[PDB]
Design a protein around this ligand. Structure first.
Ligand SMILES: NS(=O)(=O)c1ccc(CCNC(=O)Nc2ccc(I)cc2)cc1
Ligand SMILES: [Zn+2]
Length: 258
């Protein structure tokens, strides 16, 4: 009876196995755009993805992860609110059953169709498993998806999903360039938070870009053909794999922009 996104094992149940679910810095949150304050001390974000080495795509039963070689400093995130160098390890998405829901963060209570998470770990902690035990261990770059024009740089991901339909399936996924998933502007909001899935560790500096990317209805329909189940189990479509907004508590969301 493992955690998931059903009526019986969904986000309102997670606190029984993971009591940090009711903690002081949980994610996601609603971004109240009027309450977020410009922080002129933040720096421009530095997204350095030219040497990124993708390896594999995995259906883990919760989402799909595009994994990177993080055994050297290739694809890194620096600057903004961050001290030091964070290495890209994987990206994944959260999405809805309908275009009106699917994001984890919200903006003035608006839900987007989906949300991309580019996950990075602080190199001063040596490995990803040590980094998740630290309050500044991870930096997750969050990007909203809205339905409209196709995102050409997403299509290579869309086209491999038939090969990882079910939980535990993986496929080789080399030479994928994550620069093709970024919007034009790197204007962002930032706040201290958590992983949005169990184990819900409070180890994330969240960096959420203001500018959504556009994907087509056909691209997101292909996400919704994935399965939560394993092969040879009853088909359960992988949709609504999002955690709703959590209390802000004693936190301030800072804006990089006026
Ligand atoms: N949605 S999100 O961006 O906030 C997000 C959710 C979850 C994760 C992965 C968490 N995995 C983990 O804690 N690692 C781990 C490693 C080694 C051992 I031994 C045990 C556990 C990444 C990003
Ligand atoms: Zn995520």
């Amino acid at each position: 009876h493992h955690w998931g996104y059903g009526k019986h094992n969904g986000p309102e149940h997670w606190h029984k196995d993971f009591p940090i679910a009711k903690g002081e810095r949980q994610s996601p949150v609603d971004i109240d755009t009027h309450t977020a304050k410009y922080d002129p001390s933040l720096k421009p974000l530095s997204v350095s993805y030219d040497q990124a080495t993708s390896l594999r795509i995995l259906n883990n039963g919760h989402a799909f992860n595009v994994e990177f070689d993080d055994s050297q400093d290739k694809a890194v995130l620096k600057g903004g609110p961050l001290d030091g160098t964070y290495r890209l390890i994987q990206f994944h998405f959260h999405w809805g059953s309908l275009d009106g829901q699917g994001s984890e963060h919200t903006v003035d209570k608006k839900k987007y169709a989906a949300e991309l998470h580019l996950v990075h770990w602080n190199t001063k902690y040596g490995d990803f498993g040590k980094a998740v035990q630290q309050p500044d261990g991870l930096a997750v770059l969050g990007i909203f998806l809205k339905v409209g024009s196709a995102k050409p740089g997403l299509q290579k991901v869309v086209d491999v999903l038939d090969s990882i339909k079910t939980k535990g399936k993986s496929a080789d996924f080399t030479n994928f360039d994550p620069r093709g998933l970024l919007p034009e502007s790197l204007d962002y909001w930032t706040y201290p938070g958590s992983l949005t899935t169990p184990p819900l560790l409070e180890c994330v500096t969240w960096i959420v870009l203001k500018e959504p990317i556009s994907v087509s209805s056909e691209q997101v329909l292909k996400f919704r053909k994935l399965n939560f189940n394993g092969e040879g189990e009853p088909e359960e479509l992988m949709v609504d794999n999002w955690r709703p907004a959590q209390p802000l508590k004693n936190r301030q969301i800072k804006a990089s922009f006026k």
